[PDB]
Design a protein around this ligand. Structure first.
Ligand SMILES: NC(=O)c1ccc[n+]([C@@H]2O[C@H](COP(=O)([O-])OP(=O)(O)OC[C@H]3O[C@@H](n4cnc5c(N)ncnc54)[C@H](OP(=O)(O)O)[C@@H]3O)[C@@H](O)[C@H]2O)c1
Ligand SMILES: O=C(O)Cc1nn(Cc2nc3cc(C(F)(F)F)ccc3s2)c(=O)c2ccccc12
Length: 315
């Protein structure tokens, strides 16, 4: 099936388009092509610096009557420098204005760590350490809850939260809305079995990011493992007469995850969506799980002394 039921009663397309690193001069056409070939979910963020151009594409396809707003599922994230209660609404509204929407289907706390407010997304001290803000996860969560009660967002959730941080919100005193989603890095080198089972056991839907291993990540290094070139995955794909990327996208789907591959290449945008026409076997699934090596695309060194850094913790 194409959508999953969230704990806010709304349905979420299990395939979305990623937009991190999509250049601002190419992402408008990318998103247009994507809606044209079937995508109805777009994953965005303020910090990607391209929400305005994403918005141009959404608005044009709405204007053209290609899709109705109700049929689209638009996700954005609150960046680390806006964790303070007084900054959350304006941050959300900037995102809405740029996307040229009147509401978001889902708004996430992008990372559990609050950073000092300012124009800098990664404010650093003279030694290169990120400068924390003294906000905590629970007060940020209450600010997110207010956005629902103001109708700016239909669903709220979290991203890059470990199981103890998820648990902190679920146990939050006076919790009004549970998180709907936890968006985390997830692929055959970072399989996340424990965090996924915890979240699903609590009726929290998990979205898998970097499902292709983010080959265009700007800190990539030669020695890094490469999913798309892994002979073992290539072989599974060959078995199914599909591309390696198709297998990597279908794998999270079969774990009841949402998956959000990024591309600005029209042929690939289309390729990536043709994943509803084949199945991996249970054996394939366990075999892909066996390639776990606890490897992360996204875990920036300058942030690892933040109190709320999420990846010391086993999960
Ligand atoms: N919550 C967060 O902290 C967080 C963190 C990281 C990512 N995310 C979200 O997850 C999305 C996906 O993750 P990602 O951008 O890191 O990486 P990804 O989707 O794993 O990989 C994107 C890379 O794969 C290439 N590609 C796409 N389709 C391909 C295909 N069929 N065959 C071969 N290469 C293909 C793309 O090239 P072209 O674009 O040149 O086609 C691009 O270089 C992001 O864009 C963002 O929306 C969220
Ligand atoms: O953010 C994206 O969507 C992609 C993303 N990831 N990363 C690696 C990161 N690693 C982190 C670790 C923490 C931490 F919580 F661990 F402290 C907090 C924040 C980050 S950013 C980036 O540095 C980045 C820079 C610009 C735009 C997008 C990103």
């Amino acid at each position: 099936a194409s959508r999953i039921l969230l704990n806010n009663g709304a349905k979420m397309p299990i395939l979305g388009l990623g937009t991190w690193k999509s250049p601002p001069g190419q992402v408008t056409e990318a998103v247009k092509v994507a809606i044209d070939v079937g995508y109805r979910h777009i994953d965005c963020a303020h910090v990607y610096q391209n929400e305005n151009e994403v918005g141009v594409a959404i608005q044009e396809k709405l204007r053209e009557q290609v899709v109705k707003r109700e049929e689209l599922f638009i996700v954005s994230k609150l960046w680390c420098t806006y964790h303070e209660k007084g900054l959350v609404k304006g941050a959300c509204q900037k995102t809405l204005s740029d996307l040229k929407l009147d509401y978001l289907d889902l708004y996430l706390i992008h990372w559990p760590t609050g950073f000092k407010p300012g124009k800098e997304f990664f404010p650093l001290d003279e030694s290169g350490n990120v400068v924390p803000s003294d906000t905590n996860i629970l007060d940020t969560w209450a600010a997110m809850e207010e956005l629902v009660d103001e109708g700016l967002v239909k669903a709220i959730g979290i991203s890059n939260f470990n199981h103890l941080q998820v648990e902190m919100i679920l146990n939050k005193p006076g919790l009004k809305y549970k998180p709907a989603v936890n968006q985390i890095e997830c692929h055959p080198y970072l399989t996340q079995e424990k965090l996924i089972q915890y979240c699903q056991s609590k009726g929290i839907v998990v979205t898998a990011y970097s499902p292709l291993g983010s080959p265009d990540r700007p800190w990539a290094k030669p020695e890094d493992p490469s999913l798309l070139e892994d002979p073992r995955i290539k072989a599974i794909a060959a078995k199914h007469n599909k591309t390696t990327a198709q297998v990597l996208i279908r794998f999270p789907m079969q774990r009841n995850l949402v998956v959000i591959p990024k591309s600005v290449t029209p042929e690939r945008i289309a390729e990536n969506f043709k994943v509803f026409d084949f199945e991996l076997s249970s054996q394939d699934m366990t075999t892909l799980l066996s390639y776990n090596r606890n490897w992360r695309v996204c875990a920036l060194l300058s942030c690892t002394s933040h109190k709320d850094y999420p990846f010391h913790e086993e999960f």
